[PDB]
Amino acid sequence: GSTLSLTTGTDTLTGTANNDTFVAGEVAGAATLTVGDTLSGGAGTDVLNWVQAAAVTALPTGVTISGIETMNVTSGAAITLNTSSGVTGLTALNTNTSGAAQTVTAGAGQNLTATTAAQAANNVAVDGGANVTVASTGVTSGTTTVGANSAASGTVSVSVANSSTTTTGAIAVTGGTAVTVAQTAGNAVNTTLTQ
Amino acid sequence: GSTLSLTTGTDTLTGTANNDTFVAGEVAGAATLTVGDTLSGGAGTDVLNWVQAAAVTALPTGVTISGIETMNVTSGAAITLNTSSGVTGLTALNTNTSGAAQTVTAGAGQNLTATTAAQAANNVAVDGGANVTVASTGVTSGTTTVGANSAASGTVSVSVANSSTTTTGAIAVTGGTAVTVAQTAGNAVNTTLTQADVTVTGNSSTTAVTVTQTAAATAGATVAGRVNGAVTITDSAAASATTAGKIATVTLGSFGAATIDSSALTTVNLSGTGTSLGIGRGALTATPTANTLTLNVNGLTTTGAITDSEAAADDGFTTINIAGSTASSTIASLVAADATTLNISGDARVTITSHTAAALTGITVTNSVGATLGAELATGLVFTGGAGA
Ligand SMILES: [Ca+2]
Ligand SMILES: [Ca+2]
Ligand SMILES: [Ca+2]
Ligand SMILES: [Ca+2]
Ligand SMILES: [Ca+2]
Ligand SMILES: [Ca+2]
Numbered sequence: 001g002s003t004l005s006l007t008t009g010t011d012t013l014t015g016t017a018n019n020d021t022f023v024a025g026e027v028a029g030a031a032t033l034t035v036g037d038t039l040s041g042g043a044g045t046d047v048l049n050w051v052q053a054a055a056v057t058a059l060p061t062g063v064t065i066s067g068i069e070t071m072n073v074t075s076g077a078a079i080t081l082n083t084s085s086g087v088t089g090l091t092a093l094n095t096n097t098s099g100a101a102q103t104v105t106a107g108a109g110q111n112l113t114a115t116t117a118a119q120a121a122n123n124v125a126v127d128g129g130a131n132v133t134v135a136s137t138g139v140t141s142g143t144t145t146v147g148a149n150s151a152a153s154g155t156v157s158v159s160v161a162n163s164s165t166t167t168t169g170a171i172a173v174t175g176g177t178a179v180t181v182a183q184t185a186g187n188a189v190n191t192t193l194t195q
Numbered sequence: 196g197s198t199l200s201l202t203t204g205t206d207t208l209t210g211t212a213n214n215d216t217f218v219a220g221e222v223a224g225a226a227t228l229t230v231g232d233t234l235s236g237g238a239g240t241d242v243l244n245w246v247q248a249a250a251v252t253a254l255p256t257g258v259t260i261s262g263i264e265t266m267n268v269t270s271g272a273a274i275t276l277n278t279s280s281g282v283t284g285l286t287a288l289n290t291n292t293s294g295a296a297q298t299v300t301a302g303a304g305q306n307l308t309a310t311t312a313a314q315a316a317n318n319v320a321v322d323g324g325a326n327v328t329v330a331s332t333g334v335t336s337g338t339t340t341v342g343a344n345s346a347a348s349g350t351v352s353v354s355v356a357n358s359s360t361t362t363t364g365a366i367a368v369t370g371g372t373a374v375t376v377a378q379t380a381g382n383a384v385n386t387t388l389t390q391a392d393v394t395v396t397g398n399s400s401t402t403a404v405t406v407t408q409t410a411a412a413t414a415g416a417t418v419a420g421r422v423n424g425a426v427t428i429t430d431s432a433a434a435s436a437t438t439a440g441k442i443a444t445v446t447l448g449s450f451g452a453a454t455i456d457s458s459a460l461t462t463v464n465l466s467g468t469g470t471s472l473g474i475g476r477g478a479l480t481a482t483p484t485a486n487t488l489t490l491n492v493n494g495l496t497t498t499g500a501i502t503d504s505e506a507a508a509d510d511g512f513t514t515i516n517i518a519g520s521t522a523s524s525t526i527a528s529l530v531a532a533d534a535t536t537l538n539i540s541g542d543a544r545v546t547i548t549s550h551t552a553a554a555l556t557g558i559t560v561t562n563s564v565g566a567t568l569g570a571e572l573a574t575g576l577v578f579t580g581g582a583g584a
């Protein structure tokens with residue numbers, strides 16, 4: 001397929017009906033998913049990569065994603081987004097933090113995956129979606145919390161890793177066809193972590 | 196292959212599966228390795244050249260380099276990077292400063308090379324990697340320090356040059372299959388530079404250590420003055436009662452107050468201008484069976500004593516062999532209190548100005564040019580010459 005780049009402006013981008021990928025990176029450290037951006041996919045090998053130093057805050061005004069199957073969202077700070085509207089045709093949403101919070105809500109029909117490195121005292125909270133997956137490492141105080149506002153259509157699969165001696169903060173799930181929460185503890189040889 | 200240029204944006208670059216090269220320069224003095232950049236190589240002739248006026252700091256958010264074998268990093272200021280993650284497939288990391296610090300950590304499987312010009316008071320520190328190489332010039336105050344946090348899989352090879360009169364700052368290595376630290380001194384004709392104190396501490400892979408320096412000299416009208424740095428070599432199992440010990444050979448090329456401590460030590464290679472060597476063996480409680488020090492000399496001259504520190508209160512070497520080679524050597528004092536046989540062999544004169552080896556039962560020169568012993572032999576002690584004076 002072809003590879004299409006968003007700008008700091010208003011973009012009107014239309015895919016090839018093929019293996020095409022949409023890049024919503026930075027320009028001078030300025031975000032490229034911006035007001036009025038409208039994206040359109042075609043055939044079913046479509047990816048949107050949204051990467052920003054700045055915290056993801058919501059979908060910006062007038063933005064519509066359509067016909068794009070996979071959405072990857074990566075931030076140098078927190079993510080807060082809802083994708084139950086504006087977005088249509090999306091089978092897979094993947095959101096990625098390293099060292100800040102996450103607060104994500106997906107539309108049913110969309111498989112959410114919230115990967116978080118060095119979670120520390122930050123809190124992950126996710127809602128809705130079809131199959132959800134939480135993958136959290138370096139955890140500490142941080143709560144993990146799923147379906148508190150809206151359950152998943154399919155399966156929940158949390159997993160949480162902690163290296164700290166300070167104890168692993170809550171995990172709560174509500175709803176889903178089947179639930180798995182998999183904790184680990186990786187603390188040092190003369191310490192006690194309570195899970 | 197094909198040649199691909201990074202921009203001040205988010206780049207998605209994919210190689211030919213061939214000899215392709217990736218350029219990560221500057222645009223308006225703005226970096227081109229930036230947030231979200233993803234690079235992909237293919238086949239095994241892949242190079243990434245990252246060049247920046249600004250200090251290298253860390254890999255930027257969302258960056259993933261993959262399928263790229265060689266990474267070259269050059270900065271107008273300091274480098275700090277860790278490459279044990281984010282980068283995958285990387286066989287070679289080369290980092291380049293001129294006049295600022297370096298603080299680099301490579302993943303095992305990656306050959307690190309940290310070249311630094313005009314090091315001055317800046318400190319190089321490197322860790323991990325497979326084979327590491329440090330190449331530092333214009334040195335002064337700067338410490339050089341390897342494997343303080345993580346040892347190399349393969350060989351360490353430091354080398355350090357100084358032109359200053361201010362003295363060469365520490366050098367420390369920890370770990371590696373074999374270690375070499377090569378100092379030089381290039382100071383002016385009426386000055387004295389005193390060289391760097393070296394410490395090597397083996398991990399349990401360290402078979403050999405080499406520590407070369409520039410020869411000492413007295414500051415003259417047309418003689419560049421040099422004093423030598425202390426060297427301290429230590430094996431892992433130096434303090435252990437039971438663990439083997441791995442450092443077998445040590446090579447010196449000039450030295451100040453030198454120490455070795457290894458229960459696996461058999462050979463010492465000496466060379467140039469020395470102050471003192473103190474040989475200790477590991478504090479193993481077991482009574483040692485192989486007790487042969489081979490001591491190959493070549494152009495060696497000593498202020499003071501080669502001592503067997505272990506012999507005094509513990510189990511030293513029973514037989515010492517000295518093989519003089521290609522140039523005259525002079526050992527001011529040889530102190531070996533558990534020594535029994537002494538065989539001087541080889542190719543060029545060995546002179547021992549004074550030995551202190553009370554338990555000697557025989558001395559046997561087999562050397563071509565000859566051997567000279569300035570100390571009066573024990574009335575009980577047999578001596579046998581060979582050809583040569
Ligand atoms: Ca398409
Ligand atoms: Ca835009
Ligand atoms: Ca599509
Ligand atoms: Ca870029
Ligand atoms: Ca290639
Ligand atoms: Ca490659």
Ligand SMILES: [Ca+2]
Pocket residue numbers: 475476477478505509
């Ligand atoms: Ca000892």
Ligand SMILES: [Ca+2]
Pocket residue numbers: 477478479480481509510
């Ligand atoms: Ca002993």
Ligand SMILES: [Ca+2]
Pocket residue numbers: 505506507508509510511532533
């Ligand atoms: Ca003794």
